[PDB]
C-alpha cells in the first residue's frame, strides 16, 4: 500500500553469477542491518563456477558489495583403507542463504562426494553441504549430514534403504528462534526427501578442519517411508516453522512436497519429532502445490495461519480452458484442537504463464493497522511478462481479496523479478518494514522502502 | 444476340480415387453481350483419400528394455491398417531417455559415462535427452528396419524426460517433416512417470522452456541440460498451434495417471500398450480415421472487366446465397456452386479466360469468355 515505487535501491553483482538467487537480512552485534545475497554461479579461483555470498551494507544509492570468503578447494583425505573426496565444481554455493543472530548459513546443494576403497566406491553423488560463517569473529565451519562410507553393493542388496547419497542438503533452510538449523533434502531416501535438524552451536563446536567425515552428537533426521504416495514427492522443497499446537514449548515444522501422491502435492505440519499433525492436499495435478509455504497471523487473533503457493495452477476461463496463472491458498488456524479444513481464501493470477504464487513473503504490519500483510510474486506477470509483486493487506477475517499495490519490474525481460523476496525487517529506521526483491537474470537486487 | 454458356468438357465425377476427376464440368465456353450476365453450375466432390502423418516417440531407458518388442510390433500393425484407410501416409520416429546430467545420470567411474551399465555385468548405450532418428517418409520397410536397431540406455530415477521430446517433435517442423495439409498424429510411448516443469531445479536448471526448436545438424536436442521441462499449458498451446493430435501409449501400471493427465490437456487420448497388438490403440486410431474436410473455391486469372457471384449448395438442398464454400463434407460427398459472371461494357480484347478451382486440388474449371 505504501511501498515507494519511484526511489529504488539497486545492488549489482558480477555478470552471469545469478546474483539475487537467494537473499536475507543480517544484523551485527551493533544492530546495523545489511543484506546477504547468494550468487550460485560465481567464478572460482580456476575460472570454474562455484557460487558465492555477498554482504551488502545499507546505502541509499546502492552499488557493489564485498564478498564473504569461503574455501573453494577440493579435498582428498586418507582414512585407513578408504579415500574421501569432495568435489566443489558447480556446487551452487549461495543457492540458499539464511541468517540467525550473527551467523550466516550459505548452502550448496550440488556438491559431490565420493569414497574409494580399493576397486569399489560409494558412487559420486550430490550429497550437498553447507557453510556456517561468523564474519565479525571470522569463524568458519561446515555441515553435511548426508555423507557416508557405505559402498554401492550394500545399497543394492538392501534395496536402497536409508539411502542419503542424493540428498542435496541445503535446497531449503530455516532456523528456529532457539538456534536450531533445519535443512530440507528433496532427494533424500532415493528422492523421497528428508529433513536434517542440528543446533548451530553444536555444529560450530563439533567441527575439525581436515576430517571430511564426522557426526554431530545432537542431530536428528526424518525417517524413510514405505508408502508409495511419498515416492518422488520431493519432501523438503520448502520448509518453514511455526506454532500450531497451542503449546509454546514445542515448535512445529511445515514442509512442502510439490509432487506428493503422483504429482498432486501436499503440505504437512509435523512436530519436532517428525510426527504428522496435519496434511493439506493439492487441488489439481502438476500445479506444484507446496512450491512455497509461509506462516504468519493475518487474522490478527494470535494464531498463526498458513499460505501455500501453486505457481502452475490452470484456471477455467471462457476463451482458454487451460489458463496457467497460479494460485495462493490461505488457511486460518481455528480455536482449540480443530483441524485445518477448507482453504479460507483463494487468490488467482491474471497473466498467462505468470507463475503467480511462486514466492510468498510475510511483510508484517506494513501500514501499521493491526493485521499482518503478505506479498506474492509473479516472476513473469504483467502485460509485458517482465514480473510483478502484489501486496495483499490483512483484515479481521483474513486477507483482502484485491491487491493494495502492484510493483512492476524495473529490469529487462527475462530477469525473473520476484524469484526471491524478503520483508518484515526495517532497514532505514523509519518504523515501517521494507521489502527486497531479487532478480537473478539481471544479477541485481531492488530495495523498496515503505512510508 | 443472347448470352450463352456452352459446356465443352463434361466428364462425370469419379467414384473411387484409383484419371480421377473431381470437378465437373471441366471446360466451359462462355459468350456474353455488353452489360449482360450469365449463370452456370459447377459440382465438386471429394473422391481422394486424406493425408496422414504419424510420428512415434519411444522410451529407450532400462525399464523399457524388454518392452521394445511391444512398441516395435505397434508400428508394424499401425502402419498396415492406415495403408488400407489412406494412400498418403507418412511415418517417422524418435527416441528419448532423460536429461544427461547428475543426479539423473551416473557419472562415476570414468567408465560409467561410456556406458551407465557398468556396475552390472552387461553393457548398454550412453545417455541422451532426445534424438530424431527417422523423418516422416512413405517407405514402411525402412521404418521397420530402422526401428529394429534401437537399444536402451540407463538412468537413475523412475520419472523420465519425455515431455521435452513432445515439444521438440511438435515445434521442429522442417526436421520432423510435418506436412501443411494433413492430419498430424503424435504417438507417445512410455511405462513410468514423467518429469514436469520446475522438476529440473534438482539438477541446477531454472531456465523455463521457451518452446523453440533446438534440434541441430546432429539430430540431438541441444538445450536438454540448459532449460527446464515444459509445462502442461505450453504443451497444450503448441499442440493447438501446430495442429497435432496426441495419443498416450502406456502400460497398464500407469494408465490411470495419464488418464488423469488427459483431462488437463484437451484433445489428447489414452490407450494401453499391451503385448499382442495393443488393440485399444489401433481401435482408437481407426476411430480417429474419420477425417472430413471442407471445400472452398478460388478464382484465378479473373479479368478486371468481369465480376463473379457465388451461390453455395452444401449437403441437402439448403441453398446459401453469397457463399462459395461448404464445410462438414464427408469423404465422398458432393456439393454444387452456381456462379454468375457479369461483364461491364464491352472489352476491346475479344477473347479472355479464367479458372475456378477448389482449394488444395489439382482439378479446376476453365471458362473461356468471348464478347459478342
Amino acid at each position, epitope marked *: 500500500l505504501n511501498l515507494d515505487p519511484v526511489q529504488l535501491t539497486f545492488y549489482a553483482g558480477p555478470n552471469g553469477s545469478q546474483f539475487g538467487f537467494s537473499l536475507d537480512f543480517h544484523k551485527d552485534s551493533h544492530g546495523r542491518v545489511a543484506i546477504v545475497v547468494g550468487a550460485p554461479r560465481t567464478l572460482g579461483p580456476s575460472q570454474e563456477e562455484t557460487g558465492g555470498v555477498f554482504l551488502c551494507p545499507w546505502r541509499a544509492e546502492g552499488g557493489q558489495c564485498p564478498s564473504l570468503l569461503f574455501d573453494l578447494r577440493d579435498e582428498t583425505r586418507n582414512v585407513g583403507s578408504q579415500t574421501l573426496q569432495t568435489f566443489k565444481a558447480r556446487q551452487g554455493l549461495g543457492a540458499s542463504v539464511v541468517s540467525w543472530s550473527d551467523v550466516i548459513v550459505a548452502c550448496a546443494p550440488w556438491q559431490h562426494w565420493n569414497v574409494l576403497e580399493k576397486t569399489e566406491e560409494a558412487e559420486k553423488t550430490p550429497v550437498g553441504s553447507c557453510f556456517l560463517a561468523q564474519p565479525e569473529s571470522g569463524r568458519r565451519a561446515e555441515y553435511s549430514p548426508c555423507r557416508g562410507n557405505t559402498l554401492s553393493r550394500i545399497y543394492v*542388496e538392501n*534395496d*536402497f534403504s536409508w539411502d542419503k547419497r542424493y540428498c542435496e542438503a541445503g535446497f531449503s533452510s530455516v532456523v528456529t528462534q532457539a538456534g536450531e538449523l533445519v535443512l530440507g533434502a528433496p532427494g533424500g531416501y*532415493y*528422492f*523421497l526427501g528428508l529433513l536434517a535438524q542440528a543446533p548451530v552451536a553444536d555444529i560450530f563446536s563439533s567441527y575439525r578442519p581436515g576430517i571430511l567425515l564426522w557426526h554431530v552428537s545432537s542431530q536428528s533426521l526424518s525417517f524413510d517411508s*514405505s*508408502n*508409495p504416495e511419498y*515416492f*518422488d514427492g520431493y519432501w523438503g522443497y520448502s520448509v518453514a516453522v511455526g506454532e500450531f499446537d497451542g503449546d509454546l514449548n514445542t515448535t512445529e515444522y511445515v514442509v512442502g512436497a510439490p509432487t506428493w501422491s503422483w504429482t498432486l502435492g501436499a503440505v504437512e505440519i509435523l512436530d519436532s519429532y517428525y510426527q504428522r499433525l496435519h496434511r493439506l492436499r493439492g487441488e489439481q495435478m502438476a500445479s506444484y502445490f507446496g512450491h512455497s509455504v509461509a506462516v504468519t497471523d493475518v487474522n490478527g487473533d494470535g494464531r498463526h495461519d498458513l499460505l501455500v503457493g501453486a505457481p502452475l495452477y490452470m484456471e477455467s476461463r471462457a476463451d482458454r480452458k487451460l489458463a496457467e496463472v497460479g494460485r495462493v491458498y490461505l488457511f486460518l488456524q481455528p480455536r482449540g484442537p480443530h483441524a485445518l479444513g477448507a482453504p479460507s481464501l483463494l487468490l488467482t493470477g491474471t497473466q498467462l504463464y505468470g507463475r503467480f504464487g511462486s514466492a510468498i513473503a510475510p511483510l508484517g504490519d506494513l501500514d501499521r493497522d493491526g493485521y499482518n500483510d503478505i506479498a506474492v510474486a509473479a516472476p513473469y506477470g504483467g502485460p509485458s511478462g517482465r514480473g510483478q509483486v502484489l501486496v495483499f493487506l490483512g483484515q479481521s477475517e483474513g486477507l483482502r481479496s484485491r491487491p493494495s499495490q502492484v510493483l512492476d519490474s524495473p529490469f529487462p525481460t527475462g530477469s525473473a523479478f520476484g524469484f526471491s523476496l524478503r520483508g518484515a525487517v526495517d532497514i532505514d529506521d523509519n518504523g515501517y518494514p521494507d521489502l527486497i526483491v531479487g532478480a537473478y537474470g539481471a544479477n541485481q537486487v531492488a530495495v523498496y522502502r515503505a512510508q | 444476340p443472347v448470352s450463352e454458356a456452352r459446356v465443352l468438357e463434361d466428364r462425370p465425377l469419379s467414384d473411387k480415387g484409383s484419371q480421377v476427376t473431381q470437378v465437373s464440368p471441366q471446360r466451359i465456353a462462355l459468350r456474353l453481350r455488353p452489360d449482360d450476365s450469365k449463370n452456370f453450375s459447377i459440382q465438386v466432390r471429394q473422391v481422394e483419400d486424406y493425408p496422414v502423418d504419424i510420428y512415434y516417440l519411444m522410451d529407450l*531407458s*532400462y*525399464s*523399457m*528394455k*524388454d*518392452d*521394445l*518388442w*511391444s512398441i516395435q510390433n505397434l508400428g508394424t500393425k499401425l502402419a498396415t491398417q492406415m495403408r488400407k484407410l489412406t494412400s498418403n501416409l507418412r511415418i517417422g520416429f524418435g527416441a528419448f531417455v532423460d536429461k544427461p546430467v547428475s543426479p539423473y545420470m551416473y557419472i562415476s567411474p570414468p567408465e560409467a559415462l561410456e556406458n551407465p551399465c557398468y556396475d552390472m555385468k552387461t553393457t548398454c548405450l550412453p545417455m541422451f535427452g532426445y534424438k530424431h532418428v527417422l523423418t516422416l517418409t512413405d517407405q514402411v520397410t525402412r521404418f521397420n528396419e530402422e526401428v529394429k536397431k534401437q537399444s536402451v540406455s*540407463r*538412468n*537413475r*530415477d*523412475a520419472p523420465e524426460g519425455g515431455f521435452d521430446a513432445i515439444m521438440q517433435a511438435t515445434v521442429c517442423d522442417e526436421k520432423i517433416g510435418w506436412r501443411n495439409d494433413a492430419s498430424h498424429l503424435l504417438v507417445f510411448t512410455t*511405462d*513410468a512417470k514423467t518429469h514436469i516443469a520446475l522438476d529440473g531445479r534438482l539438477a541446477g536448471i531454472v531456465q523455463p522452456n521457451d518452446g523453440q526448436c533446438h534440434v541441430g545438424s546432429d539430430n540431438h536436442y541441444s538445450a536438454s541440460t540448459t532449460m527446464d521441462y515444459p509445462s502442461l499449458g505450453l504443451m497444450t498451446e503448441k499442440l493447438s498451434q501446430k495442429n497435432i493430435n496426441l495419443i498416450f501409449a502406456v502400460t497398464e*501400471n500407469v494408465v490411470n495417471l495419464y488418464q488423469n493427465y488427459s483431462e488437463l490437456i484437451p484433445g489428447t487420448t489414452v490407450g494401453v500398450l*499391451s*503385448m*499382442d497388438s495393443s488393440n485399444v490403440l489401433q481401435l482408437i486410431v481407426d476411430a480417429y480415421g474419420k477425417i472430413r474436410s471442407k471445400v472452398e473455391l478460388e478464382v484465378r486469372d479473373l479479368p478486371e472487366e468481369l465480376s463473379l457471384s457465388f451461390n453455395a449448395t452444401c449437403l441437402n438442398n439448403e441453398v446459401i446465397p453469397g457463399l462459395k464454400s461448404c464445410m462438414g463434407l464427408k469423404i465422398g460427398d458432393t456439393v454444387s456452386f452456381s456462379i454468375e459472371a457479369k461483364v461491364r461494357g464491352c472489352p476491346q480484347e475479344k477473347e479472355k479466360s479464367f479458372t475456378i478451382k477448389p482449394v488444395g486440388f489439382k482439378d479446376s474449371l476453365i471458362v473461356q469468355v468471348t464478347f459478342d
Partner: antibody, heavy 125, light 108 residues
Framework: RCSCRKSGPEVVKPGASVKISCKAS????????MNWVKQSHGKSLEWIGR????????LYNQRFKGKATLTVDNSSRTAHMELLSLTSEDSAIYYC??????????????????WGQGTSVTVSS | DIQMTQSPSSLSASLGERVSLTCRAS??????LSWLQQKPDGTIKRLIY???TLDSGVPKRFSGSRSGSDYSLTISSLESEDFADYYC?????????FGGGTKLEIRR
C-alpha cells in the same frame, strides 16, 4: 532378510469356508504385490490372483474368480485369502509370493520372487 | 492365455554331468520368463529371471540363454545339492502360467 510366514494346516468340512494368512516382514509390504499360488497333489502350480496392498484392488484368474477373495491388512503386514464353499477339489497346498508393484528407480518387476512356506488345506466329512 | 511346455518331464543324471531343460511358449513372450527350483521340503526359490539373469547367491553354474520361442536352463558340473524340481513362469500376460515341471534324478 525377507520372510513370508504362513499359517498352519487346516482341516475343513466339504461346504465350509477357510481363511489362511501370510505374514510378511523384511520389506516395505506396500510397494509389492501379493500373489497366491495353488499347487495340487500332482504338482501343476496355478496362479490364483494378486492383491494390491496400497489400495485393495484384486486381479483374479478367471478359474478362481468366484472361489477365493483376496484381502489385506496393512496394520499387521498380513495378507489373507478366503476360500468359499469348499469341496474335495480344493485340498492342496497354497503359496504366497511377493512381486514388485512400485519402483523408485529405472527398473521393472521381473516376476514372483521370495515365495512362502506352503499351507496345506484338506477338505473332508 | 499362454501355455508353456517343458520338454523333459523327468531327467536322470550323475554327479558332474551337464544337463539342460527347455521351456517353450505358445504365444510370444519377449524375455518375461523365470526359472524356479523346489527342493524336497516344499520351499520354492527363483534361480534365473529375465530368461538369462542369475539371482544373488546362485552359483555361476546355472545358466539360461534364449528368447523368442524356446528357452533353456543349463547346469554344468552338476552337484549333489541341486537335485530338485524345476518350473518356468512366464508373467508376460495375465493370467500367469507355469511350466509342466521337470524333476531331476540321480543316476547310480
Amino acid at each position: 532378510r525377507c520372510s513370508c510366514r504362513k499359517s498352519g494346516p487346516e482341516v475343513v468340512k466339504p461346504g465350509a469356508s477357510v481363511k489362511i494368512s501370510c505374514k510378511a516382514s523384511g520389506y516395505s509390504f506396500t510397494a509389492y504385490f501379493m500373489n497366491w499360488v495353488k499347487q495340487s497333489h500332482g504338482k501343476s502350480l496355478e496362479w490364483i490372483g494378486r492383491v494390491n496392498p496400497y489400495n485393495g484392488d484384486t486381479l483374479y484368474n478367471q478359474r478362481f474368480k468366484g472361489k477365493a477373495t483376496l484381502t489385506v491388512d496393512n496394520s499387521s503386514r498380513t495378507a489373507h485369502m478366503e476360500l468359499l464353499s469348499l469341496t474335495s477339489e480344493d485340498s492342496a497346498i497354497y503359496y504366497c509370493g511377493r512381486s514388485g508393484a512400485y519402483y523408485r528407480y529405472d527398473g521393472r518387476a521381473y516376476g514372483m520372487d521370495y515365495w512362502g512356506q506352503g499351507t496345506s488345506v484338506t477338505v473332508s466329512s | 492365455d499362454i501355455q508353456m511346455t517343458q520338454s523333459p518331464s523327468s531327467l536322470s543324471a550323475s554327479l558332474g554331468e551337464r544337463v539342460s531343460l527347455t521351456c517353450r511358449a505358445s504365444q510370444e513372450i519377449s524375455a518375461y520368463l523365470s526359472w524356479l527350483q523346489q527342493k524336497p521340503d516344499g520351499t520354492i526359490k527363483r534361480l534365473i529371471y529375465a530368461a538369462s539373469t542369475l539371482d544373488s547367491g546362485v552359483p555361476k553354474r546355472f545358466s539360461g540363454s534364449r528368447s523368442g520361442s524356446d528357452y533353456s536352463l543349463t547346469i554344468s558340473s552338476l552337484e549333489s545339492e541341486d537335485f530338485a524340481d524345476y518350473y518356468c513362469l512366464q508373467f508376460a500376460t495375465y493370467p500367469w502360467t507355469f511350466g509342466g515341471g521337470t524333476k531331476l534324478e540321480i543316476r547310480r
